[PDB]
Short mmCIF file of C-alpha atoms and ligand atoms in Angstrom, two decimals:
data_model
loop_
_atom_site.label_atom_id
_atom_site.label_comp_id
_atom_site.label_asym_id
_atom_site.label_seq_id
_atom_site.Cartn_x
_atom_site.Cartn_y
_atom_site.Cartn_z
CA UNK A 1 82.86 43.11 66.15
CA UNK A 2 85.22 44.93 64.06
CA UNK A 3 85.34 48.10 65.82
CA UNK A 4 86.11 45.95 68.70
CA UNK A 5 89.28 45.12 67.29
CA UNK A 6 89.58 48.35 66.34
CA UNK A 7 89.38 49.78 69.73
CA UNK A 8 92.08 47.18 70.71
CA UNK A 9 94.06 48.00 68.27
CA UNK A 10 93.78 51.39 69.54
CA UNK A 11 94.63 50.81 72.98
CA UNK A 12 97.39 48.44 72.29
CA UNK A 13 98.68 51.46 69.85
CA UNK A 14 98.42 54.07 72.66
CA UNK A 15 100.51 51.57 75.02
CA UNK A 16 103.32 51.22 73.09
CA UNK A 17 103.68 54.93 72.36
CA UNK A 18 103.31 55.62 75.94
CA UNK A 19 106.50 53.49 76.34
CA UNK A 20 108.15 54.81 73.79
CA UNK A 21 107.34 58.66 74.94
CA UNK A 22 108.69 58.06 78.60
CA UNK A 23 111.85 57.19 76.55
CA UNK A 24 112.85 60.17 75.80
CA UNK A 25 112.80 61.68 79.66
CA UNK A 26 115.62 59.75 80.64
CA UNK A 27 119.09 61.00 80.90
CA UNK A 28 122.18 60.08 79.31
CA UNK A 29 123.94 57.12 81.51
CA UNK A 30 120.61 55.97 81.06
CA UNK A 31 119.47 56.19 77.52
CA UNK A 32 123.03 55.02 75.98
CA UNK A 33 122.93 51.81 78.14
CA UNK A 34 119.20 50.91 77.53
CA UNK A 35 119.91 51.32 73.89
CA UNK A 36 122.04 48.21 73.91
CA UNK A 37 119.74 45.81 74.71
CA UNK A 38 118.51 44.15 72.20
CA UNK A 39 115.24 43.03 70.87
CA UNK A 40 114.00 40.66 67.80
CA UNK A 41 112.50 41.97 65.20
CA UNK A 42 109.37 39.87 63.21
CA UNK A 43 110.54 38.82 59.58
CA UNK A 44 106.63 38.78 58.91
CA UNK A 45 104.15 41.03 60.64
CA UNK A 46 100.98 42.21 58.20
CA UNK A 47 98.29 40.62 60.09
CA UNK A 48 96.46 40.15 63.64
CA UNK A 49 98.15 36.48 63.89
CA UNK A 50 101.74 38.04 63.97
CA UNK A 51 101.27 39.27 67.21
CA UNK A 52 102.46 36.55 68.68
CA UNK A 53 105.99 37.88 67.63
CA UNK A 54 105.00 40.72 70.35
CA UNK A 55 104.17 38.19 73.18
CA UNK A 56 107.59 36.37 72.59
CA UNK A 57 108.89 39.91 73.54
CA UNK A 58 107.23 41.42 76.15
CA UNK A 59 109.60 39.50 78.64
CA UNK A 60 112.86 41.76 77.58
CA UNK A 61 110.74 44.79 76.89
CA UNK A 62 109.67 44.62 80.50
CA UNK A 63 113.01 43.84 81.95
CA UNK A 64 114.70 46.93 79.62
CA UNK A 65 111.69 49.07 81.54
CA UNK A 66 112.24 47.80 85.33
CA UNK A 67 116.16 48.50 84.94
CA UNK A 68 115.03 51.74 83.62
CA UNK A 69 112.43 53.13 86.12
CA UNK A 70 104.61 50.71 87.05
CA UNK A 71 106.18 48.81 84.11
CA UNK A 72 104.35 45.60 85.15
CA UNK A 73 100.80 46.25 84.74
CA UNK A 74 101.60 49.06 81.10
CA UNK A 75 102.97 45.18 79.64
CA UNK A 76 100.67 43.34 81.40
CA UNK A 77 97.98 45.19 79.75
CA UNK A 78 99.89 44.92 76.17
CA UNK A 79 99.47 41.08 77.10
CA UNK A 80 95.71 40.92 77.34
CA UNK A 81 95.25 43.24 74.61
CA UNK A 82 97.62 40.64 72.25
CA UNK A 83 96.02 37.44 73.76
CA UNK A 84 92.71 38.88 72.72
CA UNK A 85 94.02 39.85 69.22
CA UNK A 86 95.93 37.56 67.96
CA UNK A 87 93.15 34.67 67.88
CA UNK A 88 92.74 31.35 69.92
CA UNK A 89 93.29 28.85 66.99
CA UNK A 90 96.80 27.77 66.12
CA UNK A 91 100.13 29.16 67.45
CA UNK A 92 101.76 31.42 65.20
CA UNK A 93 105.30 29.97 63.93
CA UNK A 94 107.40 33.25 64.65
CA UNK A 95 110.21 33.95 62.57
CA UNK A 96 112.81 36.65 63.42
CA UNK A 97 115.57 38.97 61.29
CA UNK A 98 118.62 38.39 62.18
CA UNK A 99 119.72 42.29 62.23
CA UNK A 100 118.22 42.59 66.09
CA UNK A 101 117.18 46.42 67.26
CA UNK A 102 117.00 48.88 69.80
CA UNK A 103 113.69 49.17 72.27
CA UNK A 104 113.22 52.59 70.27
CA UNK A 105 113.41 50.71 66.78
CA UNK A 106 111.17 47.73 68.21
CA UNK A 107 108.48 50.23 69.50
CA UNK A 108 108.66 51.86 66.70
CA UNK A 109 108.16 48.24 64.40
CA UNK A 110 104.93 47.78 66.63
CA UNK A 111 103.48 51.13 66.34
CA UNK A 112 103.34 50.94 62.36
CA UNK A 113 102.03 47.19 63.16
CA UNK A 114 99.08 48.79 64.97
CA UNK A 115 98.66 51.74 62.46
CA UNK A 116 98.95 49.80 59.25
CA UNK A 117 96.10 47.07 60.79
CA UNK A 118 93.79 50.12 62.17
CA UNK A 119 94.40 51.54 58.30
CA UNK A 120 92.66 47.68 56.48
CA UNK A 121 89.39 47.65 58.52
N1 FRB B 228 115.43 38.12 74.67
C1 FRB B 228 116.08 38.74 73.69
N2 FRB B 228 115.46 39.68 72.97
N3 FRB B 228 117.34 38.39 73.44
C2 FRB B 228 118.49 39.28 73.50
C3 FRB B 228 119.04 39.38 74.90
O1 FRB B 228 119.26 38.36 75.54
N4 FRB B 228 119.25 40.61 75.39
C4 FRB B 228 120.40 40.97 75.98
C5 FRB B 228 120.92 42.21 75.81
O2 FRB B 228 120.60 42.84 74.82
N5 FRB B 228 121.82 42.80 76.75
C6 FRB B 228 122.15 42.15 78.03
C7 FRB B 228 121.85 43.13 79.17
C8 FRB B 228 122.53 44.50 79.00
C9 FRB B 228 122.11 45.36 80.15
C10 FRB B 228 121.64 46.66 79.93
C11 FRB B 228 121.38 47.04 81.24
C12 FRB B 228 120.89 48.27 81.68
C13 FRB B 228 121.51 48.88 82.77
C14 FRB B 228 121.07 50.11 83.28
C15 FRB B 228 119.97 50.78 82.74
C16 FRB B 228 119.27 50.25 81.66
CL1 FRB B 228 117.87 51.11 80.96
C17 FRB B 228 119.70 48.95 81.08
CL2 FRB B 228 118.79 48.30 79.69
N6 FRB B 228 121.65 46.10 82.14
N7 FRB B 228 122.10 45.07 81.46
C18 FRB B 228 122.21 45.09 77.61
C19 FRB B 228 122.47 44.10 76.47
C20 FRB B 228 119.50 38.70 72.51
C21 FRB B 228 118.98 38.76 71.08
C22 FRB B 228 119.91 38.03 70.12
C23 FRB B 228 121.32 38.62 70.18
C24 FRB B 228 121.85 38.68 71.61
C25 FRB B 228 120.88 39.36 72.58
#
């Protein structure tokens, strides 16, 4: 029951650092203008609940990817890995910084999410 969170946690981890790897192919005119989009970053994010604060972003991380390139089905799968994590009990009250970030600073938020969960259990 735990492990499979675990191994959710695991794929969800693997996702986003597949996204964040194929960042680093692009060019120049590329990687300077996808850098200025901008993403919210979670005031709170310590436990499976707060992954709601990834859902609420999926739509711009997907849009930064399509303008950048299949990016549907790598977020689509992020999506049923979250929907299965982040429990079916109440809706999680996000609250964001207001210091927004890069995609490369966002992944890089979610991937020490994943890590620092994987690490507790
Ligand atoms: N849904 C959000 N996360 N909201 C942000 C949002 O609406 N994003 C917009 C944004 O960051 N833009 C608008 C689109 C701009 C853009 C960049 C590109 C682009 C063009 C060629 C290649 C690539 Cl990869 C890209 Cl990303 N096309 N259009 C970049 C900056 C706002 C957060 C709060 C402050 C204001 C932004």
């Amino acid at each position: 029951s735990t492990k499979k969170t675990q191994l959710q946690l695991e794929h969800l981890l693997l996702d986003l650092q597949m996204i964040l790897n194929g960042i680093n192919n692009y060019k120049n005119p590329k990687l300077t203008r996808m850098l200025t989009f901008k993403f919210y970053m979670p005031k709170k994010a310590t436990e499976l609940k707060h992954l709601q604060c990834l859902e609420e972003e999926l739509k711009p991380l997907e849009e930064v990817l399509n303008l950048a390139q299949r990016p549907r089905d790598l977020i689509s799968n992020i999506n049923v890995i979250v929907l299965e994590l982040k429990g079916s009990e109440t809706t999680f009250m996000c609250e964001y910084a207001d210091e927004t970030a890069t995609i490369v600073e966002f992944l890089n938020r979610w991937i020490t999410f994943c890590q620092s969960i994987i690490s507790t259990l």
